[PDB]
Amino acid sequence: QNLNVGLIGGGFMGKAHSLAYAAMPMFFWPAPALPVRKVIAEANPELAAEAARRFGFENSTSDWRSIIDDPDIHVVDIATPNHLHAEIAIAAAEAGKHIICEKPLARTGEESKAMYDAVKDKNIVHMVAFNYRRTPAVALAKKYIEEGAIGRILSFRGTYLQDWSADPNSPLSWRFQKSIAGSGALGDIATHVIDMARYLVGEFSAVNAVLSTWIPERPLQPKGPVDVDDEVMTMIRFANGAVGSVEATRNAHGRNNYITFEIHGTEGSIVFNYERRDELQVAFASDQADRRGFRTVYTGPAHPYGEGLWPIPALGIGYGETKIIEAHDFFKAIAEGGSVSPSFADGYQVALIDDAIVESAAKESWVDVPQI
Amino acid sequence: MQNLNVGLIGGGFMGKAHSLAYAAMPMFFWPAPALPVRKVIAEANPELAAEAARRFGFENSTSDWRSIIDDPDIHVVDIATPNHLHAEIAIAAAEAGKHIICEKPLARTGEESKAMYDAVKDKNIVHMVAFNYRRTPAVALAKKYIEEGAIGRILSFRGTYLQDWSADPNSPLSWRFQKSIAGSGALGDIATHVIDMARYLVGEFSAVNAVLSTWIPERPLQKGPVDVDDEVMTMIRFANGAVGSVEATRNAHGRNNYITFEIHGTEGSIVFNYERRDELQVAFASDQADRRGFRTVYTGPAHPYGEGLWPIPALGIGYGETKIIEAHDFFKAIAEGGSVSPSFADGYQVALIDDAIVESAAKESWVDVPQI
Amino acid sequence: QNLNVGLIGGGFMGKAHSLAYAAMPMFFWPAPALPVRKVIAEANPELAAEAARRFGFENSTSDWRSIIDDPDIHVVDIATPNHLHAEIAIAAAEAGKHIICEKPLARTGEESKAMYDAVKDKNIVHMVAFNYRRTPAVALAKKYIEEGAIGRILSFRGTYLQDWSADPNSPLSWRFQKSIAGSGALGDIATHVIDMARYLVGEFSAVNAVLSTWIPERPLPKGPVDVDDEVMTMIRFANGAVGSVEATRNAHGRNNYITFEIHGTEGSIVFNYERRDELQVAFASDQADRRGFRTVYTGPAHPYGEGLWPIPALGIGYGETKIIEAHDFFKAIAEGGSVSPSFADGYQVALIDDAIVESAAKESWVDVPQI
Amino acid sequence: QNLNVGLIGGGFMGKAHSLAYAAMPMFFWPAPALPVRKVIAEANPELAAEAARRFGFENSTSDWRSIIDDPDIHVVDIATPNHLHAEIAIAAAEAGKHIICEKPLARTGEESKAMYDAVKDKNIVHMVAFNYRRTPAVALAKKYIEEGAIGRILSFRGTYLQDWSADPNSPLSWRFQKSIAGSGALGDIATHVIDMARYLVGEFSAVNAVLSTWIPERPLQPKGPVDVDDEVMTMIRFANGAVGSVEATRNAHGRNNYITFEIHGTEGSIVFNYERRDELQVAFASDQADRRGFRTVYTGPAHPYGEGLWPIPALGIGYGETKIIEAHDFFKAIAEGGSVSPSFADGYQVALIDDAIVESAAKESWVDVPQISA
Lengths: 372, 372, 371, 374
Ligand SMILES: NC(=O)C1=CN([C@@H]2O[C@H](COP(=O)(O)OP(=O)(O)OC[C@H]3O[C@@H](n4cnc5c(N)ncnc54)[C@H](O)[C@@H]3O)[C@@H](O)[C@H]2O)C=CC1
Ligand SMILES: NC(=O)C1=CN([C@@H]2O[C@H](COP(=O)(O)OP(=O)(O)OC[C@H]3O[C@@H](n4cnc5c(N)ncnc54)[C@H](O)[C@@H]3O)[C@@H](O)[C@H]2O)C=CC1
Ligand SMILES: NC(=O)C1=CN([C@@H]2O[C@H](COP(=O)(O)OP(=O)(O)OC[C@H]3O[C@@H](n4cnc5c(N)ncnc54)[C@H](O)[C@@H]3O)[C@@H](O)[C@H]2O)C=CC1
Ligand SMILES: NC(=O)C1=CN([C@@H]2O[C@H](COP(=O)(O)OP(=O)(O)OC[C@H]3O[C@@H](n4cnc5c(N)ncnc54)[C@H](O)[C@@H]3O)[C@@H](O)[C@H]2O)C=CC1
Description:
The structure is a homotetramer. In chain A, a hairpin with a 5-residue loop joins strand 14 and strand 15 (about 280-285). The longest helix of chain A is centred in the C-terminal third of the chain and has 20 residues, at about 345-365. The relative contact order of chain A is 0.17. In chain A, strands 16-15-14-13-7-12-11-8-17 form a 9-stranded mixed β-sheet. In chain A, strands 3-2-1-4-5-6 form a 6-stranded parallel β-sheet, with helices on both faces. The first copy, chain A, has a two-stranded antiparallel sheet with strand order 9-10. Chain A starts with a strand and ends with a strand. The first copy, chain A, is of the alpha/beta class and about 375 residues long. Chain A is globular, with a radius of gyration of 20 Å. Chain A contains 10 helices and 17 strands. The first copy, chain A, folds into 2 domains: about 1-135, 3-Layer(aba) Sandwich (Rossmann fold); about 135-370, Dihydrodipicolinate Reductase, domain 2 (2-Layer Sandwich). In chain A, helix 4 runs parallel beside helix 5. Chains in contact: A-B, A-C, A-D, B-C, B-D, C-D. At the A-D interface, helix 6 and strand 16 of A face helix 6 and strand 16 of D. Strand 16 of chain B pairs antiparallel with strand 16 (about 295) of chain C, so a sheet runs across the interface. The structure holds 1,4-dihydronicotinamide adenine dinucleotide (4 copies). It is classed as oxidoreductase. Keywords: NADH-dependent dehydrogenase, Rossmann Fold, Gfo/Idh/MocA family, oxidoreductase. It forms a tetrameric assembly. The entry is titled "Levoglucosan dehydrogenase, complex with NADH".
């Protein structure tokens, strides 16, 4: 069975998404369904037609509403900047389309809520693209935790450290503009870590945070204001009694895409570093005392999703494989008439955690995270 | 834009990696040198062939590879079969005036490989052997440092390829363990990748001195004998006067896809580990005395091929990106009427090196490597 | 010149300190002064006598006051549990003796204050034994920072993760009893990280903390743990940087994992004591195609390198940190100078700990009093 | 019991040796015996007196013969360059002293044979100072192998890679002079790896090697010739049927004290890197399939020698602890009327391997390695 995709935005995530739709059935065969790259929307006709050629779409448009109104489109895939997520998803939901939307779901908790409300009562699959939790090593961590293999979780530490804008001469873009992005590091990269904490540990009860801006204006490439955070650090109380912290920054020289976590359980520990994403480190307390420590486990056929990936460990997982697994599970949900995680429910919950972090930093005090 | 019809022969492991490369290359390298059309796939029987076409997105399928050779509208023949069919298929393709990419090793013996070289060497066709690991961005970056003189003159090279997927004696007797099909075991299957790297980064081999080992002499079928090497180690004299060694094995517990090198130059060193392929390690002698050592460099836009890959370092290179780069350079050679490296000339030189290694092991002496 | 040492405590730190006194001049020659292991005190005569023979002291005693009252003694070295730090240090200061005291300085801010007040108007050398800041790699980090090589510091992350007590059957030693220890992970190990932060970044302005006890009772029949197993705190530095420190006794796979990561405007530095020979430094100024963390092995080219091993990676262990400590302590004494960290630093750390405890109790930011 | 030590030479090993004697009882208590730093010899009386003060020796001399002839000296510790090991050890053995000698035992197999022949019938403890095998990680690897925990050994790889002389302006010290040193990288650093190979895998059956000199002259401490190898690589056939190789060099930028090995067994693998000596990496085939790989094990109380070292893993092993452990075992053998490994027998076997490597390199052929009993 074919599912006709309408992809809105042909930039960085347009590419990664197009790769996923091209490759997914090659990896996961027989596929839950066959993606058809039907129409791509971009900001003007020339951009759109060029994107269609590059990414292999059958049609282009400069008006995304023409995708919403097309009765032959089954999936709407939102790959635009954060300011258009809600308007597009809400239209798509009203037209009864399945939706994958890039993170953060929207710019604020309130805007995210409207998207969740728009889908929560329809029999459509809705997904927020936190692809990093589908790194096989992160799925392997989940497996170990659910089996009890590290016991009860005490403590979680999570980072997302980057440096692509660590230079003040690096130009202003929508990622530095509150009106567009909603927040800086918090929305752009801390949300990936937060989803990861929710996935592996559980729901957040409360946060206590500090937001920092290090580079308050950038050249327009003549300068404009950066009115978002460059860096966030937050302590966390988890609803199950665990404690933790998350730190994200755009200003860590030497750190490129350093999404990490360290989890301490009563019977073991798990460490992950996405810069070496093929590896998961796991220390089991039950190891004999003279041979006890972290094992470096390379993901392959024996680990979650391994049947759909490469025939030996360390043949190498890249960014693409994570989007491929994401597309697979999205399509599986559609084909099976089920739901997928993370959904717009997960999207909205994160946006509420973001609001709580901002409020916490403003008031310099603990803030309870409202639940869903 | 120029569209080239590909006939792929084999829909196994490399059939998948190759299909991914043909679907993805234009998305990464845009504007593309030419657009691959997945036109026909050949497999061992008609049911296999049709299923592989559905899986890998080929328009047509056949159980007979000759029908690809004889089809005037196929521009590219891509040989992804086991080693016993490389020569017959490439020689047919050459005679039909097709561009050819052939999986490594080029064939089972030096003499088979020579017949393939002789068939293409005086034709105006692009011919390539699929030593894709040299197109890991980290390896291309190593080449850049070297050719720039940034580590000075090369003194010594150490290369490995350590695996463990058949380290269990109950792993069965596939074609890779059968000399009549494979030609050799670890030597032809995995040492050739390291030998190609050594030729690319250091230069031509002058002599070798080797030991071949078989640790598991019989396996279950699907009982039968293993008549190839499980492991090879060889010393090398390079024609430029550097020294080195290469070691490959199927029997190193904990080693998954551990293709590595370490190069010592007069002014620096380079160390590469494919299990962490995003990284190149480089130590420059020119560093100030109190801040000298190996730098871990993560590949991205600033490094070779980076313009066609991901927007920041450590977003993550996998196996697929190496095949995408290989496909890009193959197609660029075709579009531009040039040649590509490594070619059948390279494939044949490596077959001669393997033969010299076998001779060496048998005679327990240094053997000069014949030049093509 | 000889400096006569009176060492109080013959346990773990007794052994490390005795090693430092025995080895320091072999390493740093000519030496600032020659340590004489003159008297070791222990808790009873037989322990003391055995400790003097094991550690090579001229004399033993089962009464630490015999050291204070011995006019031959130049140096009092306090290697007892935390409850005796204050009374011993104060008596030694009143006797005009140079003092090194193990961390934490005392059990609380107030007890620490008494120790500081006893030395602050004197010119004796007083030192608190935060020896991890004298790992050569950490001193290297300080050098890079002071040179401006990573620019201005924005952010600090520090850990001390251990697991020696992660098993609930691990017994109720003095480190788990508030009356003796003062606090748990916070006093015992987080203080090393706080010291490193103060050394590399600067003074703490405010803290916001959470304290956790995971294992509330232990075999002595059992008894209650009334200290923290784990602490995490956010930090505002006086200079405007931000950071955090995390320490725990409950991290399976982590043995002596005292680490930091510093983000400056022109570079980053990472250190991991479990691989203490290494310092990781990333300079923004690296050419754009060869930029990232370089792993620097400490040796002759690096701070303290003239007194250590002749090549990098010959190997620094725990003892070398203590030897360097002793070296600088004795150099201060012999020149009539002061040493860092002093009891001023020890007391400042003790104020930071009190602010951390207070912060955790009140679940709010607390300003750190300055001495 | 007190054992009087006469140390000959107060250079770099003088210091590490003096540390071992001063510290060993603090770590391993009760001690087998108490080392006494009685007399140190150096090459002139001013050096000797200065060394005695630096290293805490009671007495000094400029004539090491006065240590041999001193009836109150129990232990002779030879820490000179390679050219004096033999003359000193042979005189100490004839005088009935216990002996620890620095590696390599002597300059050649023949000279090493003389040393072994002088001790093998005497009732003395004799030791060659291959201290790196007493890194606790390496002792741990021995434990795993002897237990059968990685099965039968198929393959061994060892390196000793350094760069302290990778600048050709680094001066022509004795280490670059064949007449003093006997060989370059081979004798100075490959011998440590060869000892580990013997200890962990077994005896060598044959070798096939290449020796390289990259920098053929250096400034004198005007220039002189370097007439030793900078670099060695050798393939190995082990007597038990395992294969392997060893590589050592003075010319590897970024490598400081990179003594490593990788061992492949039928049921697991072991990897060690001295630049991170606190760690041993071990991969067990028996791990469940979804949690299988190299474990990074930090050495401490649970591991060999752990009762004498630090109370938790990763408090930190440095070079000195290896010398302490070495002195512990040496004194233990003296105190118990026993012997220790590696002895002059082992020293001589290594010198024979070196000779075979040299010969192999010159003939470009496999050379069988004689056993010390031949
Ligand atoms: N899951 C992940 O790992 C990542 C997610 N993201 C998210 O993906 C989304 C897109 O980010 P990037 O692709 O990096 O941004 P980008 O700036 O590379 O591309 C966004 C594209 O949106 C197009 N666009 C703008 N207005 C439009 C309109 N009215 N109609 C059609 N197209 C329009 C632009 O022309 C541009 O090409 C963002 O929400 C971002 O937060 C971004 C990077 C990674
Ligand atoms: N460059 C690299 O990194 C790698 C290269 N290789 C090489 O690729 C080649 C294929 O290896 P794999 O894909 O691993 O083998 P495979 O066994 O996974 O697949 C080979 C396929 O060839 C098909 N085949 C056999 N006879 C055929 C015929 N007459 N016509 C059409 N198809 C036929 C089989 O049905 C099978 O599906 C080999 O030469 C191997 O050495 C393999 C793995 C990796
Ligand atoms: N890296 C570092 O700087 C470390 C510092 N420490 C600190 O060192 C101090 C001692 O710790 P450890 O040596 O590990 O404890 P420990 O329990 O090993 O030894 C303490 C010794 O003090 C002795 N003692 C008790 N009362 C005494 C008295 N009245 N007179 C003489 N001796 C007495 C005990 O008999 C015991 O042998 C503590 O303040 C601790 O916080 C401990 C470990 C490491
Ligand atoms: N086990 C290990 O890890 C190491 C072993 N070694 C070995 O230890 C030995 C000494 O090497 P280093 O200490 O590095 O050399 P060095 O050159 O630092 O010291 C040698 C000392 O021997 C002294 N000496 C020379 N002739 C003498 C005489 N007739 N009487 C008394 N002393 C005399 C010299 O004055 C010099 O101070 C060598 O055999 C070397 O191969 C060296 C370094 C490390």
